[PDB]
Amino acid sequence: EFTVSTTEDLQRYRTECVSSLNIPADYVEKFKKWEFPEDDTTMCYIKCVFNKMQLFDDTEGPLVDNLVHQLAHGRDAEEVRTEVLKCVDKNTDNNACHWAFRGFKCFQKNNLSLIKASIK
Numbered sequence: 417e418f419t420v421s422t423t424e425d426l427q428r429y430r431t432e433c434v435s436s437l438n439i440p441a442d443y444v445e446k447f448k449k450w451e452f453p454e455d456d457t458t459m460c461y462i463k464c465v466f467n468k469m470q471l472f473d474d475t476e477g478p479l480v481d482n483l484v485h486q487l488a489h490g491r492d493a494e495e496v497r498t499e500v501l502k503c504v505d506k507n508t509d510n511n512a513c514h515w516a517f518r519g520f521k522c523f524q525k526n527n528l529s530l531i532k533a534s535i536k
């Protein structure tokens with residue numbers, strides 16, 4: 417089974433991803449206020465955290481059932497699934513960091529509240 421991620425899963429994954437990727441504190445500050453510059457440093461951050469939460473695979477791409485579970489807590493599956501899938505695309509520029517980001521970007525645009533609430 418896949419289980420949901422919380423604030424202190426995120427906290428852990430944030431510090432691990434900052435470490436391995438060597439993310440400037442600069443960038444970390446923006447992430448904490450849900451701001452995301454459109455460059456590789458931010459893109460690979462998102463991939464890393466998604467990898468650790470089991471929401472994205474570098475080969476397979478977005479993991480749809482897990483994304484819906486994460487967001488829905490297995491409650492409002494069908495509605496959330498429809499919104500999640502609108503943001504699912506293929507690895508068009510063979511850049512896994514970009515792929516994960518572009519998904520996250522699509523979904524944060526309209527549904528950022530749900531993302532924050534999925535952690536809470």
Ligand SMILES: CCCCCCCCCCCCCCCCCCCC(=O)O
Pocket residue numbers: 421426430447448449450462465469471483486487500503519520523524531534535
């Ligand atoms: C389906 C496309 C993805 C939409 C986001 C799904 C949300 C579930 C994942 C849990 C939260 C991580 C979202 C990425 C935010 C970046 C991490 C740092 C955020 C922060 O500092 O609070």
